[PDB]
Design an enzyme around this catalytic site. Sequence first.
Site, mmCIF file in Angstrom:
data_model
loop_
_atom_site.group_PDB
_atom_site.id
_atom_site.type_symbol
_atom_site.label_atom_id
_atom_site.label_comp_id
_atom_site.label_asym_id
_atom_site.label_seq_id
_atom_site.Cartn_x
_atom_site.Cartn_y
_atom_site.Cartn_z
ATOM 1 C CB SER A 263 36.288 48.979 43.834
ATOM 2 O OG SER A 263 36.837 48.618 45.084
ATOM 3 C CE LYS B 134 34.531 46.414 46.152
ATOM 4 N NZ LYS B 134 35.232 47.379 46.995
ATOM 5 C CB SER C 242 34.342 51.522 47.172
ATOM 6 O OG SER C 242 34.939 50.852 46.117
ATOM 7 C CD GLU D 44 37.907 44.170 47.436
ATOM 8 O OE1 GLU D 44 39.073 44.479 47.715
ATOM 9 O OE2 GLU D 44 37.335 44.703 46.507
ATOM 10 C CE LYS E 97 32.606 50.603 43.420
ATOM 11 N NZ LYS E 97 33.689 51.538 43.667
ATOM 12 C CB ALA F 97 42.169 53.114 44.318
#
Length: 263
Positions: free
Chosen positions: A45, A48, A105, A141, A209, A212
């Site tokens: 993440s 992003k 996230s 994703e 930010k 995982a």
Amino acid sequence: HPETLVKVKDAEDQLGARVGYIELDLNSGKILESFRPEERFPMMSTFKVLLCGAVLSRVDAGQEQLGRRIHYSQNDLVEYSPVTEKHLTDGMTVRELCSAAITMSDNTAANLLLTTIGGPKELTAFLHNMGDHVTRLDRWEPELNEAIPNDERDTTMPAAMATTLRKLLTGELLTLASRQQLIDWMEADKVAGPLLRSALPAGWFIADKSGAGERGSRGIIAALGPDGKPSRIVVIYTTGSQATMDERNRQIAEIGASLIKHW
């Protein structure tokens, strides 16, 4: 300071995995401290931030508007979509999707914004154009979190991510109002509490930010500093550990504690 490097090595030992670390002066771009700076790690993440940076450059160029509402349906929802699941009926604006993707996230928000931009290849083209020839986004994703050993897909290097973050945050690539909007979203991060934020002293600034992914992957990119201003960028990535989420968090927060003790 070299004592932080003692703690990064100790974290590699406790997690039984590679930890990439870099500390970069925000003003000068000077690398203050590094550990595996040019080894690849899955971004998870932390991409992003980069994605909403690409969105904001389109907003600056008059090609996108923050108030534009994106409608989507249940068919778009992927795992871990806390904010987009609650707005199926009315959709969300570009601004709301970047806040959800950074602050929470939210995975679907990232996919929707990636579609807006032309997909992984266009975020990678954007990175290449601002001088990052290392970071690459290849998948959507949730696939990009796979972190299969030696795979270069969806990776960055700590030194490349730190330099890119610095450019996004202080360079002329984005309008100051846009740089500030990206910083505000990162500052409002709600999901990184057990990481650098648990070591941050009162009065300090942090914009960050987390990420995982599979195979023990955990990471954080951050701009932080004393007296309410950012003055350093810290990037920390790990992958390969079989340790629990709490152990991974604990070691990153202890790396934070060391870098703040030795600031």
